[PDB]
């Protein structure tokens, strides 16, 4: 068949990010080991964080993102509302609520500068 | 509503080139396309997209994600490779020849825009 099914981000804590992306996809991981967790994706896909490629560097700039569709632009702001009003886990906004030509969108920067795109579905 | 990291978003300069790149490697058609934004399928409802619209790539800067496609079996991997690499239509740059690693039987091409892609078996 050929489908891209697993998302692979390097990550330089594996706890710290398995906890980060716990909170984010409001989901255990299905798969953990010490050096790499996988979560569930869509379908049989995998969305991974591993420590055995490179360790990320904040100030190199990245030519990706890891985008979440949701279903309508309301589910995006009380979404960002939700996630920088909790004080428990530090988000690090990049761009504020704002309208793209999928319309409501926002972006986060995970703990090792991977870029978050919240959006609504296209 | 449920958070899925469903969209993976890479950046191209040349979206053309890429549209009939990732053509070739999926063996699949692009569900949207417009001038600076492609989508193909991936798993489920999932989609993968390129876009011109952001940060240009460049080819010697180094890269902390992979685009990873999981095939079922060692048997495939080895086979898809011997494939892409054969044919002469679309310049394959390989990054690593088949090898073992932690995910079984893989390999690692790289994108005309020095995305990382893996192959790796269920």
Same mark, same amino acid.
């Given at each position: 068949? +050929?489908?891209?099914?697993?998302?692979?981000?390097?990550?330089?804590?594996?706890?710290?990010?398995?906890?980060?992306?716990?909170?984010?996809?409001?989901?255990?991981?299905? =798969?953990?080991?010490?050096?790499?967790?996988? =979560?569930?994706?869509?379908?049989?896909?995998?969305?991974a964080?591993?420590?055995?490629? %490179?360790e990320?560097?904040? %100030? +190199?700039?990245? =030519?990706?993102?890891?985008?979440?569709?949701?279903?309508?632009?309301?589910?995006?702001?009380?979404?960002?509302?939700?996630?920088?009003?909790?004080?428990?886990?530090?988000?690090?906004?990049?761009?504020?609520?704002?309208?793209?030509?999928?319309?409501?969108? =926002?972006? +986060?920067?995970?703990?090792?500068?991977?870029? +978050?795109?919240?959006?609504?579905?296209?």
């Amino acid at each position: 068949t +050929i489908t891209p099914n697993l998302q692979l981000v390097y990550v330089s804590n594996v706890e710290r990010s398995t906890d980060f992306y716990r909170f984010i996809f409001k989901k255990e991981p299905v =798969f953990v080991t010490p050096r790499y967790v996988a =979560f569930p994706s869509s379908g049989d896909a995998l969305f991974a964080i591993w420590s055995g490629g %490179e360790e990320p560097v904040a %100030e +190199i700039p990245r =030519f990706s993102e890891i985008g979440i569709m949701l279903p309508t632009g309301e589910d995006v702001d009380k979404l960002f509302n939700e996630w920088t009003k909790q004080k428990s886990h530090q988000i690090i906004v990049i761009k504020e609520p704002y309208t793209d030509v999928f319309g409501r969108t =926002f972006l +986060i920067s995970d703990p090792d500068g991977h870029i +978050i795109r919240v959006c609504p579905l296209d």
